[PDB]
Swiss-Prot record, chain A:
Protein name in UniProt: Protocadherin-15
Domain notes per entry: Cadherin repeats 1 and 2 mediate calcium-dependent heterophilic interaction with CDH23. Three calcium ions are usually bound at the interface of each cadherin domain and rigidify the connections, imparting a strong curvature to the full-length ectodomain.
Designated gene of the protein: Pcdh15
Subcellular location: Cell membrane
Span of domain Cadherin: 19-126, 127-233
Species whose genome carries this gene: Mus musculus (Mouse)
Cysteine disulfide links: C11-C99
Subunit structure: Antiparallel heterodimer with CDH23. Found in a complex with TMIE and LHFPL5. Interacts with LHFPL5/TMHS; this interaction is required for efficient localization to hair bundles. Interacts with MYO7A. Interacts with USH1G; this interaction may recruit USH1G to the plasma membrane. Interacts with TOMT. Isoforms CD1 and CD3 interact with TMC1 (via N-terminus) and TMC2 (via N-terminus). Interacts with PIEZO1.
Source organism, top-level taxon: Eukaryota
Entry comment describing in which tissues the protein is expressed: Expressed in brain and sensory epithelium of the developing inner ear. Expressed in the retina, in the photoreceptor inner segments, the outer plexiform layer, the inner nuclei layer and the ganglion cell layer and, more diffusely in the inner plexiform layer (at protein level). Not detected in the retinal pigment epithelium (at protein level). Expressed in the spleen, dorsal root ganglion, dorsal aspect of neural tube, floor plate and ependymal cells adjacent to the neural canal.
Lineage: Eukaryota, Metazoa, Chordata, Craniata, Vertebrata
From Swiss-Prot, chain B:
Disease linkage: Defects in Cdh23 are the cause of waltzer (v) phenotype. Waltzer mice are characterized by deafness and vestibular dysfunction due to degeneration of the neuroepithelium within the inner ear.
Compartment annotation: Cell membrane
Positions glycosylated per UniProt: N133, N184
Tissue: In adult animals relatively high levels of expression are found in testis, skeletal muscle, heart, eye and thymus, and lower expression in kidney, lung and brain. Found in the sensory hair cells of the inner ear.
Organism for this UniProt entry: Mus musculus
Protein's name according to its UniProt entry: Cadherin-23
Domain Cadherin: 12-110, 111-206
Subunit and partners: Interacts with USH1C and USH1G. antiparallel heterodimer with PCDH15. Isoform C1: Interacts with CAMSAP3; leading to inhibit CAMSAP3 ability to induce microtubule bundle formation.
Length: 236, 208
């Protein structure tokens, strides 16, 4: 008994470890990107005397191509992009590599999960082309004079995690030098603007405040930024 | 004065996923949360959400995440879980996809029982008379089923892959009227194969 168990070996994994094969790749990876180097399934698919048949099942939208001889899985993205961000929201691809043992007729399914990693391929984007605030000349210093970036009226970024989180800072305006001195954003996460010096309607009636939004990519050199203007008018 | 800066997570698993095998014992540590704060604030860690909370606990001061109740991949094969870290002035949270790893922990279950079949004494050698089927929800070799008779029979064989039962020797009513065979369906997991038995009654009908 069990002398013949050598013929049941084809289609079984040629590696130890867990049954699923799990790999990660970047969103928007190019057509033909390698997803799995080598499935490590025992036996030979194709050629003149194969011991196994290999093929894909549950390959939804045909994202994955198989080369049975090399047991390699590749990305099929011609005419489209693998986009993790809205509106596509592809966070993962799961397919089955079906393996049929030619000699004994057994079928084994090998699950492959491809986890899609976010790139910082999106910049902050302001809902409006420009922003505006009116302030009374007697507003006390320390008062919040603009809250218009609240609740997605300001900048947003469709990436995930820190890649999609926004910080707001005021920049110096060479064409209105005192504007960054008169107004401040003390809490960069909210982007609310506070009055920092007393106003004087007899001296100056209008301020142009340059505000820059940035995302929070881990690498400073891969952070994206976008600029807007806030125009602040005094009233009597 | 310095406004507070909120803490941030540093684990690189938030960018991919966390794997936990379904055989992880309750009470075991599955990872450790890591975070920094530019003020050097001491940090308290936690988990958020109704279902996440039932499976995972977090030691507040160290960030060690551990398993509060058994996982079962056949019952739920993944979670999206939200972890929290606080410097006492604000809380921030972040989500991670947790994949549950398979082990072979199911035996096959047979279909369409009970199994019984009447065949005539003159049924020729080679004739398929019955089909048995079982399934098994584990992944891989642990979910692929083989069939056999225990012990094998001199009058019947079963195809190991397909469950087809054939006559392999001329029958004779006066010697045997009825056969009670034991059919075994096993998965093919390398280290811990699991299996299941069913009876198959074969009743021979008379002629001469
Ligand atoms: Ca994208
Ligand atoms: Ca992205
Ligand atoms: Ca971004
Ligand atoms: Ca802090
Ligand atoms: Ca289980
Ligand atoms: Ca299992
Ligand atoms: Ca099983
Ligand atoms: Cl049948
Ligand atoms: K976002």
């Amino acid at each position: 008994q069990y002398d013949d168990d050598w013929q049941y070996e084809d289609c079984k994994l040629a590696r130890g470890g867990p049954p699923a094969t799990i790999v990660a790749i970047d969103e928007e990876s190019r057509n033909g990107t390698i997803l799995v180097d080598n499935m490590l399934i025992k036996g030979t698919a194709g050629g003149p005397d194969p011991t196994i048949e290999l093929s894909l099942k549950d390959n939804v939208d045909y994202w994955v191509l198989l080369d049975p001889v090399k047991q390699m899985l590749f990305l099929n993205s011609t005419g489209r992009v693998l986009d993790r961000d809205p509106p596509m929201n592809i966070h993962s691809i799961v397919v089955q590599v079906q393996c049929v043992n030619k000699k004994v007729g057994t079928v084994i399914y090998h699950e492959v999960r491809i986890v899609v990693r976010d790139r910082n391929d999106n910049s902050p984007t302001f809902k409006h082309e420009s922003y505006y605030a009116t302030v009374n000349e007697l507003t006390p210093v320390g008062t919040t004079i603009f809250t218009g970036f609240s609740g997605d009226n300001g900048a947003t970024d469709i990436d995930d995690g820190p890649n999609g989180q926004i910080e707001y800072v005021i920049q110096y305006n060479p064409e209105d030098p005192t504007s960054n001195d008169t107004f401040e954003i003390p809490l960069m996460l909210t982007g609310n603007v506070v009055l920092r010096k007393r106003l004087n309607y007899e001296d100056k009636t209008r301020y142009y405040v340059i505000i820059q939004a940035n995302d929070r990519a881990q690498n400073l050199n891969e952070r994206r930024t976008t600029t807007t203007t806030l125009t602040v008018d005094l009233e009597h | 004065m310095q406004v507070n800066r909120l803490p941030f997570f540093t684990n690189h698993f938030f960018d991919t996923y966390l794997l936990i095998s379904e055989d992880t014992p309750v009470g075991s540590s599955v990872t450790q949360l890591l975070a920094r704060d530019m003020d050097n604030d001491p940090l308290v860690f936690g988990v958020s959400g109704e279902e996440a909370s039932r499976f995972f606990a977090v030691e507040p001061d160290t960030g060690v995440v551990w398993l509060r109740q058994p996982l079962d991949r056949e019952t739920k094969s993944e979670f999206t879980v939200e972890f929290s870290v606080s410097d006492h002035q604000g809380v921030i949270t972040r989500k991670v996809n947790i994949q549950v790893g398979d082990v072979n922990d199911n035996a096959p279950t047979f279909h369409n029982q009970p199994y019984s079949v009447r065949i005539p004494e003159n049924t020729p050698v080679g004739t398929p008379i019955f089909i048995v089927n079982a399934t098994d929800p584990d992944l891989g070799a642990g979910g692929s089923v083989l069939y056999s008779f225990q012990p094998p029979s001199p009058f019947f064989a079963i195809d190991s892959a397909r469950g087809i039962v054939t006559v392999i020797q001329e029958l004779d009513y006066e010697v045997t009227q009825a056969y009670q065979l034991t059919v075994n369906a096993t998965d093919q997991d390398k280290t811990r194969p699991l299996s299941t038995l069913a009876n198959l009654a074969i009743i021979i009908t008379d002629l001469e």
